[PDB]
Design a protein around this ligand. Sequence first.
Ligand SMILES: C[C@]12CCC(=O)C[C@@H]1CC[C@@H]1[C@@H]2CC[C@]2(C)[C@@H](O)CC[C@@H]12
Ligand SMILES: C[C@]12CCC(=O)C[C@@H]1CC[C@@H]1[C@@H]2CC[C@]2(C)[C@@H](O)CC[C@@H]12
Lengths: 177, 177
Amino acid sequence: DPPAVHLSNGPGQEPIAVMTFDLTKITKTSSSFEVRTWDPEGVIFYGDTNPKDDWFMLGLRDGRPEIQLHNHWAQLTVGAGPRLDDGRWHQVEVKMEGDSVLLEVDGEEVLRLRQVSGPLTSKRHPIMRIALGGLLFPASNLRLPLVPALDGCLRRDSWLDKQAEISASAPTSLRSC
Amino acid sequence: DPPAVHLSNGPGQEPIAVMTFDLTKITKTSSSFEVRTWDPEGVIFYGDTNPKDDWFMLGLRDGRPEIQLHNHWAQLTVGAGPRLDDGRWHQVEVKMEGDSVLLEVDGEEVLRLRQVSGPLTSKRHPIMRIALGGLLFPASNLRLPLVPALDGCLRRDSWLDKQAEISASAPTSLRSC
Ligand SMILES: C[C@]12CCC(=O)C[C@@H]1CC[C@@H]1[C@@H]2CC[C@]2(C)[C@@H](O)CC[C@@H]12
Ligand SMILES: C[C@]12CCC(=O)C[C@@H]1CC[C@@H]1[C@@H]2CC[C@]2(C)[C@@H](O)CC[C@@H]12
C-alpha cells in the first residue's frame, strides 16, 4: 500500500486529519482515494462549510457506501454501490458536476445526487473543511446515526484542490497500515 | 418475452395502464418487473397518492435508473445502478422496507433511499395510483424534467398487492413486443 494510513486511531471518535480550503480559489471540485476494510459501518470522510446546516458525510453502512448531506438545497440519507467490506482495495471518487454530486466506485458511477448544490465559488461561508475518518459534530447529530469509527485503510487520496488548501491539522500521529 | 407490452404507444404522453390501490388493504409494499430498451431516457412507472405533494417516479436518464420522489418527508432526484439501455432484459424491483425505498437491478441492490416514507397503512389519502409508462401530471412539473416516452418493453410485472387493487384502466389498447 503506497503510504497507507489507518482511518481511525483507537476508539474512533475524531478524525485523523482535518484540511481547510478557500472556496474562492477552488477549481477542482472532486476528491479521490483508495480504501480497504473488513468493517461494514463507519465514516470515511466528512466535509462542511457549517456543521449546523451545510455538511456532507461519506461512510459505509451494511458494507455499502452511504451519503448523508444537509444543505440549503437538499437533505438526504442514501445508500448505493457494491459492498466495499471485502478487504480488497477499492477506488472511490466523489465529484461535484454542475448541481450534482456523483459517487464512482472502481471506475463505475454508482450514484448521482441531482439538484443538491449551488456552485462552490458563489457559496456562502467561503471556507470548506474536510475531515478524514470522523465527523466534526457528534454522530448522534447525523440524519441517521452510525458508529463513526471505520476500521480500514486509506491511500492515494487527493482532496479538492491542493492549491486552495489553507491548512491541514492532525489531532494525533497518523498510523500506517 | 412472456406476454410483453410496449411502454409507450406512439407519442408517449400518457401511461399505457393505471392501477388504483386501497392502502388500508396493502400488505406487499413492493413491485417488480422486467424491462428491455435501447432508449436512454423516459418514464418506466409513476405512483402517487396526490400528484401535487405525494408522488414517485422511476425512469431512465442517461441509460441508468433515476428516481424522483416528493412527499412530506423527502424531495429528491437520484440516479443509480448500471445502464439498462443495452437491449437486454433486466429484472427490477422497487420495495419499501421500513422507512426506506430500495431499488434492485438484476438481483443486486443498487440504491437505498433512507428516511423517505412513513408507513402506507397509517398514511393520509388511502388510495395509491400506479401509472405504467407515463406520468399523471405534466413532465414539466417533475423536479427535473425528462422526455417521458420510454421506447422499451415491459414483462413479468407485479404491482404492490393485487388483493388491494381497486381498479385498473387503460386509455387505449396495449401493444405487444
Ligand atoms: C461532496 C463535496 C464536493 C466533492 C468533493 O470532493 C467532496 C465535497 C465534500 C463536502 C461537500 C461537497 C459538495 C457540496 C457540499 C455538500 C456542501 O453543501 C456542504 C458540504 C459539501
Ligand atoms: C415506491 C412505492 C413503494 C414500493 C412500490 O412497489 C412502488 C411505490 C410507488 C409509489 C411510492 C411508494 C413509496 C411511497 C411513496 C413515495 C409515497 O410517499 C408517494 C408515492 C409512493
